[PDB]
């Protein structure tokens, strides 16, 4: 019954099998954590080593989300900065939905999954208002 | 369920609750674990007692003592010891290797021995012993 837990980039393979389903992935790892705690109530060197292995696994899985979170951040930084057709094409972009998808990916990981870019994320949100101001000045 | 298990249960309950409180408190339990060498945390022992404590007492007693001994014992008399003697290393095959018995008589250094026993416990008359005739040997 300890051997049923014998387990690091296989996690990325699991990610390759793929929104909130990510949260479900973290919670099934949390369920492994809680049945380990129940077995702590049942049983420690052999147990503390796999306890520390859970310390390894969920932190590294959080970081393999966090790297993609950083990529989301930087690729959003990118777009932060016959012309009327281009203005209309950017006017069509649902863009706030993409910013919201990134915001939901980040803040849920920080809070429910528990850098100084949090204020940058806030300036991400206000960025659209600033861009609308710039487009208003671009009207003329 | 039996009558001598009550005897050993009373003796072991005496061993654990050593001061005389009538209830297993955490300190006497850790005293027992530290006599056995273990000094775990003060949060895992809480969970262990909380699974064993049914009454909400934070202290387990003789009814709970025999409840855990009952579940661990009868959940998991003469079948096993005579079974796993040599044939239970074979798991319902009825063919015991002679080399195992030669090894057994090799290691324990016995002065005089002839293996005519297996020659004259041969009830299938082939050169090995099935399990029923193995009990007939015993």
Curated annotation (Swiss-Prot), chain A:
Top-level taxonomic group: Eukaryota
Annotated localization: Cell projection, Cilium, Flagellum; Cytoplasm, Cytoskeleton, Flagellum axoneme
Transmembrane segments: none
Coiled coil: 85-105
This protein's domain notes: Dynein heavy chains probably consist of an N-terminal stem (which binds cargo and interacts with other dynein components), and the head or motor domain. The motor contains six tandemly-linked AAA domains in the head, which form a ring. A stalk-like structure (formed by two of the coiled coil domains) protrudes between AAA 4 and AAA 5 and terminates in a microtubule-binding site. A seventh domain may also contribute to this ring; it is not clear whether the N-terminus or the C-terminus forms this extra domain.
The protein's role, per its UniProt record: Force generating protein of eukaryotic cilia and flagella. Produces force towards the minus ends of microtubules. Dynein has ATPase activity; the force-producing power stroke is thought to occur on release of ADP.
Record family assignment: Belongs to the dynein heavy chain family.
Assembly with partners or alone: Consists of at least 3 heavy chains (alpha, beta and gamma), 2 intermediate chains and 8 light chains.
Protein name listed in UniProt: Dynein gamma chain, flagellar outer arm
Record organism: Chlamydomonas reinhardtii
Parent-record interval covered: 981 to 1161 of 4485
From Swiss-Prot, chain B:
Ranges for domain EF-hand: 4-39, 40-75, 109-138
Primary location class: other
GO cellular component terms attached to this protein's record: dynein complex; microtubule; motile cilium
Subcellular locations according to the entry: Cell projection, Cilium, Flagellum
Keyword Repeat annotated: yes
InterPro entries for the chain: CALM/Myosin/TropC-like, EF-hand-dom_pair, EF_Hand_1_Ca_BS, EF_hand_dom
Amino acids binding Ca(2+) 1: 17, 19, 21, 23, 28
Signal peptide: none
UniProt entry keywords in alphabetical sequence: Calcium, Cell projection, Cilium, Dynein, Flagellum, Metal-binding, Microtubule, Motor protein, Repeat
SMART domains to which the protein is assigned, alphabetical: EFh (SM00054)
Any GO molecular function: calcium ion binding
Residues that hold Ca(2+) 2 according to the record: 53, 55, 57, 59, 64
Job description of the protein: May be involved in the calcium-mediated regulation of dynein motor function. Binds 1 mole of calcium.
Subunit (UniProt): Consists of at least 3 heavy chains (alpha, beta and gamma), 2 intermediate chains and 8 light chains.
PANTHER family: CALMODULIN LIKE 3, MYOSIN LIGHT CHAIN 1, 3
Protein name: Dynein 18 kDa light chain, flagellar outer arm
Organism: Chlamydomonas reinhardtii
């Amino acid at each position: 019954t300890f051997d049923k837990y014998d387990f690091l980039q296989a996690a990325y393979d699991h990610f390759m099998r793929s929104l909130e389903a990510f949260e479900a992935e973290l919670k099934k790892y949390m369920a492994i954590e809680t049945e380990v705690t129940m077995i702590n109530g049942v049983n420690h060197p052999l147990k503390n080593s796999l306890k520390a292995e859970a310390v390894s696994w969920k932190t590294q899985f959080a970081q393999n989300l966090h790297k993609q979170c950083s990529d989301d951040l930087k690729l959003d930084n990118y777009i932060r900065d016959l012309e009327d057709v281009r203005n209309v094409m950017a006017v069509l972009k649902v863009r706030e939905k993409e910013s919201e998808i990134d915001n939901l990916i980040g803040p849920i990981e920080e809070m429910y999954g528990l850098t100084t870019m949090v204020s940058d994320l806030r300036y991400g949100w206000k960025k659209l208002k600033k861009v609308a101001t710039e487009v208003s000045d671009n009207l003329t | 369920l039996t009558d001598e298990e009550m005897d050993m249960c009373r003796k072991a309950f005496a061993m654990f609750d050593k001061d005389g409180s009538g209830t297993i408190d955490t300190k006497e339990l850790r005293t027992a674990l530290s006599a056995l060498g273990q000094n775990p945390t003060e949060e895992d022992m809480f969970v262990m007692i909380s699974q064993v404590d049914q009454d909400g007492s934070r202290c387990i007693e003789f009814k709970e003592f025999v409840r855990v001994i009952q579940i661990n014992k009868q959940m998991s008399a003469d079948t096993l010891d005579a079974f796993v003697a040599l044939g239970g290393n074979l798991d319902k095959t009825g063919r015991i290797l002679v080399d195992k018995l030669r090894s057994i008589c090799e290691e324990f250094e016995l002065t005089v021995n002839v293996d005519r026993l297996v020659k004259d416990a041969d009830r299938d008359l082939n050169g090995f012993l099935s399990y029923d005739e193995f009990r007939a040997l015993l």
